[PDB]
Structure 1
Amino acid sequence: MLELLLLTSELYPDPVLPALSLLPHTVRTAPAEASSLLEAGNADAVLVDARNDLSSGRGLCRLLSSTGRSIPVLAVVSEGGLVAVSADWGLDEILLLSTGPAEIDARLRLVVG
């Protein structure tokens, strides 16, 4: 069903959200820059890889958010990064890198519909 644009420096989606492969959603990766948004095409959501660099991660999410009208922004963080996540990120949903497939599916459904 869903197309996901994952913004990361990884070059494979698997280190970012390992469980995502188990789901039928399609994932394209792009560098963690604001210009990658151009590459968002028909994507249903954008995931921002914020596992390691929280400052840039939060910066991206802020830039990505709102404007119009707008497509959902998700941040993927590690457990130690949860304290840094707050409303000023402009997030629609947050995900832990260890989140299981069922939980990934549920949060994606709820954030898109």
Structure 2
Amino acid sequence: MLELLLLTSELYPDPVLPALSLLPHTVRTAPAEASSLLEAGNADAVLVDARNDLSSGRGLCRLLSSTGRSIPVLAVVSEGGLVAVSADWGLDEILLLSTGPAEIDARLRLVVGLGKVSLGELVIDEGTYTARLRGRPLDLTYKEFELLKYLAQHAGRVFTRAQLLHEVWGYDFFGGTRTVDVHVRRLRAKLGPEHEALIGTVRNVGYKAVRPA
């Protein structure tokens, strides 16, 4: 009753997951391509092969992730390869290549079968990449909107420039930037006289966010 779409170059679903033939779910196969995500129709779940290669499997799990709406993404890895399997893959469920038929059935029937938190005086709207600080208008540049976003949810957490750099930027990451200094100085300006006490900037500890009061 589920259409499972395999992105695997094995040309058969059998060595990727052996016991799946014991369940009468339909399996539609294609090589591990992003364009075969356009090959998804009424697929209820999707399995990626990452048994020997954790990197492209994790990135494909990432390629699916955050796109929306979304159909939940699954992957199959090895047991010594479960070290890299984490929440950073964008997984909803991970499968091993030795999980049983009723086990895969239960994981599938679990996974295929609200608003933002208010409020730290900085609302986050995901549409135009902008916020709202005690006032409707709040212009945030491409990276001056996520810098506040990064310090928003991790309020109270201490983050160094590089720790911020690789999540706030791509990052590349360049050096000798002061881009944090350029931003936080700018992010402490468009926030008006009030809420200047939203970021904790003590010397050489990085740039932590201080939540009220």
Instruction: Give your verdict on TM over 0.5.
Output: yes
Query: How far did residue 87 of structure 1 move?
Result: 1.0
Q: Give the aligned CA root-mean-square deviation in angstroms.
A: 3.8
Report the CA distance between 1:28 and its aligned residue.
0.6
The number of equivalent residue pairs is: 113
The ranges of structure 1 where at least 4 consecutive aligned residues each deviate by more than 6 angstroms after the TM superposition are: none
Q: How far did residue 33 of structure 1 move? A: 1.3
Gaps of 5+ in 1: none
Shift of 1:80: 1.0
SS at 1:29's partner residue? strand
CA deviations 1:79-104 (Å, max 9, x no partner) are: 11100111110001000000000100
Distance in 1 (CA, whole Å) between partners of 2:107 and 2:65 is: 18
Pairing 1:1-113 to 2, within 5 Å after superposition: 1-112=1-112
Alpha-carbon distance between aligned partners in 2 of 1:88 and 1:102, rounded to the nearest angstrom: 27
Tell me the distance in 1 between the aligned counterparts of 2:65 and 2:46.
10
Looking at structure 1, the residues matched to 41 and 52 of structure 2 have their Cα atoms a distance apart, in angstroms, of 26
CA distance in 1 between counterparts of 2:30 and 2:49 reads 11
Q: Distance in 1 between matches of 2:35 and 2:29?
A: 13
Displacement of 1:30 in angstroms is 0.8
Deviation at 1:65, TM superposition (A): 1.4
Percent of aligned positions that are identical: 99
Q: What is the CA–CA distance in structure 1 between the aligned matches of 2:29 and 2:22, rounded to whole Å?
A: 17
Any idea what SS the aligned residue of 2:28 has?
A: strand
The structural deviation recorded for 1:66 is: 2.5
Greater radius of gyration (CA): 2
In 2, Cα distance between the equivalents of 1:48 and 1:72?
Answer: 11
Q: Deviations over 1:27-79 (max 9, x none)?
A: 01111111110001110011001111110000100011131110010011111
Alignment TM-score, normalising by the size of structure 2: 0.52
CA distance in 2, matches of 1:57, 1:79: 15
Q: Give the stretch that moved more between structures: 63-72 or 94-103.
A: 63-72
**Structure 2 Cα separation of the partners of residues 54 and 109 of structure 1:** 25
Asked which structure has the greater RCO (Cα within 8 Å, sep 6+), the reply is 1
Q: Distance in 2 between matches of 1:48 and 1:59?
A: 10
Which is richer in strand?
A: 1
Judging by fraction of residues, say which structure has more helix. 1
